[PDB]
Amino acid sequence: PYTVVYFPVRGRCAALRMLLADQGQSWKEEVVTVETWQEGSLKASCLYGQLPKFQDGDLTLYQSNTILRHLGRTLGLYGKDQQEAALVDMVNDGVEDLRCKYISLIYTNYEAGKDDYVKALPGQLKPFETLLSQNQGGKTFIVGDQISFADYNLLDLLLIHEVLAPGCLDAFPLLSAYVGRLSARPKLKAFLASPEYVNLPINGNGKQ
Amino acid sequence: PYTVVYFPVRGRCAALRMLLADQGQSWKEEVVTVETWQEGSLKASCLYGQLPKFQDGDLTLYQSNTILRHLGRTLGLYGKDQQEAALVDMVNDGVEDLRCKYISLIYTNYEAGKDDYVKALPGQLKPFETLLSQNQGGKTFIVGDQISFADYNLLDLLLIHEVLAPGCLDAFPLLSAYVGRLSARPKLKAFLASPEYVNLPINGNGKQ
Numbered sequence: 001p002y003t004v005v006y007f008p009v010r011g012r013c014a015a016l017r018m019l020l021a022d023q024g025q026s027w028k029e030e031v032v033t034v035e036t037w038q039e040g041s042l043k044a045s046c047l048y049g050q051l052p053k054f055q056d057g058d059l060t061l062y063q064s065n066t067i068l069r070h071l072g073r074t075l076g077l078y079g080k081d082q083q084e085a086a087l088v089d090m091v092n093d094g095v096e097d098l099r100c101k102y103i104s105l106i107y108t109n110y111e112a113g114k115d116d117y118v119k120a121l122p123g124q125l126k127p128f129e130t131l132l133s134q135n136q137g138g139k140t141f142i143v144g145d146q147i148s149f150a151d152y153n154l155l156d157l158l159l160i161h162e163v164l165a166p167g168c169l170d171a172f173p174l175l176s177a178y179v180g181r182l183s184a185r186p187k188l189k190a191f192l193a194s195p196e197y198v199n200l201p202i203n204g205n206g207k208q
Numbered sequence: 209p210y211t212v213v214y215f216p217v218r219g220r221c222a223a224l225r226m227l228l229a230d231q232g233q234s235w236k237e238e239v240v241t242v243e244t245w246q247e248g249s250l251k252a253s254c255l256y257g258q259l260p261k262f263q264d265g266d267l268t269l270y271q272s273n274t275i276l277r278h279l280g281r282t283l284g285l286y287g288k289d290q291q292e293a294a295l296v297d298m299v300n301d302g303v304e305d306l307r308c309k310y311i312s313l314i315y316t317n318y319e320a321g322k323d324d325y326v327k328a329l330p331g332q333l334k335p336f337e338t339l340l341s342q343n344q345g346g347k348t349f350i351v352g353d354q355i356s357f358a359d360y361n362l363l364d365l366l367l368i369h370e371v372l373a374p375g376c377l378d379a380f381p382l383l384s385a386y387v388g389r390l391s392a393r394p395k396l397k398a399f400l401a402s403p404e405y406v407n408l409p410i411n412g413n414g415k416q
């Protein structure tokens with residue numbers, strides 16, 4: 001089945017975990033501690049020297065987004081056609097860009113840069129509000145009328161920003177409704193409330 | 209047909225241009241100067257406020273990698289099956305990670321960081337030499353026995369590094385042969401030698 005090898009944090013596995021949970025999939029968690037990692041052996045066997053590492057049968061994958069795309073492709077969460085597939089990618093790449101900025105803030109200069117980052121946030125979030133407004137008035141998903149892997153990734157991005165800058169979504173009616181709507185899905189709601197998710201820190205440095 | 213809107217540099221369009229050229233595709237180049245861009249109107253109409261912008265019929269796309277994936281999907285340069293598709297993504301995500309570091313160096317601290325970056329290069333390139341060694345002894349492409357969009361992107365990444373750190377590929381026999389082999393493809397060779405490619409600066413700040 002599936003196996004995700006990662007540190008004891010949500011980080012770059014939050015979205016893929018929400019996807020698996022919501023799709024009713026079972027998976028094994030192989031927790032790697034900071035101690036085990038610093039030993040060196042595992043890091044050396046990793047293609048790019050980093051985690052997450054994922055396994056689907058004997059297929060071993062690296063790169064969080066490759067994992068997301070793989071699951072989206074095999075589980076049917078990649079749009080109804082090529083046009084939608086292209087739009088899903090465009091949304092995900094957008095999410096990834098903002099995620100890198102978020103990660104840079106958290107690990108590089110949280111104390112110093114937190115204020116400027118929050119001020120610039122509205123400009124960073126507008127593109128997604130726009131995408132939503134152009135798709136059935138933001139009544140369904142980010143792309144098309146069926147959920148995609150980009151939805152889970154965008155949802156995660158939005159949730160961690162709610163924690164960073166509480167109320168940052170107030171100015172965006174469609175994103176707010178979108179978050180509430182997706183968070184209400186049966187399997188996802190159960191997962192988001194579980195100790196498995198809740199008791200894990202968002203980032204590896206205790207900042208959020 | 210196709211239309212790529214971008215600044216008069218190779219930058220993030222080099223790989224997609226090589227792909228189109230090598231696949232025998234025709235496209236229109238809509239050049240945007242720094243002056244036109246600073247006027248504000250175009251930037252405001254761009255989803256994430258950035259270029260490249262791409263058009264395939266009435267489908268408008270943003271994000272260089274989304275464009276690459278779209279072309280790979282429609283032109284059949286995305287592996288023979290899902291397993292290969294996942295591997296192609298893993299390679300591309302790896303290329304993208306190193307590209308960001310390259311971009312950070314070029315635009316953030318070329319003078320100061322050039323030495324440390326070149327010292328760390330071997331560790332950054334090893335993963336691709338490894339991927340090559342596990343695929344038919346590096347005799348064909350990065351993934352499988354047919355060219356993919358990841359190949360064009362990796363090729364571009366390798367070429368710009370040859371310019372940055374001449375001879376950096378000497379220590380990697382498979383990557384070197386790979387570069388020579390791909391650069392020898394008929395349509396690609398013609399394109400790489402043309403004024404269209406050659407007379408365009410690699411980056412927007414004249415550094416390389």
Ligand SMILES: N[C@@H](CCC(=O)N[C@@H](CSCc1ccccc1)C(=O)N[C@@H](C(=O)O)c1ccccc1)C(=O)O
Pocket residue numbers: 007009011012034037043049050051052062063064065203204205301305
């Ligand atoms: N492009 C890759 C990026 C993977 C990545 O950044 N991996 C990090 C872990 S994610 C952030 C994190 C950091 C520390 C703790 C928990 C989480 C990674 O592998 N980082 C280690 C590394 O680069 O060796 C590392 C460095 C320092 C301490 C602990 C681990 C992807 O999308 O999959």
Ligand SMILES: N[C@@H](CCC(=O)N[C@@H](CSCc1ccccc1)C(=O)N[C@@H](C(=O)O)c1ccccc1)C(=O)O
Pocket residue numbers: 093097215217219220242245251257258259260270271272273411412413
């Ligand atoms: N994730 C996106 C990133 C796009 C991007 O970085 N776009 C840049 C242009 S690429 C680098 C470049 C910079 C300057 C000149 C030529 C090239 C982009 O749109 N940058 C402009 C911007 O962000 O407004 C910009 C800033 C300053 C001067 C000129 C243009 C992708 O992969 O498509």
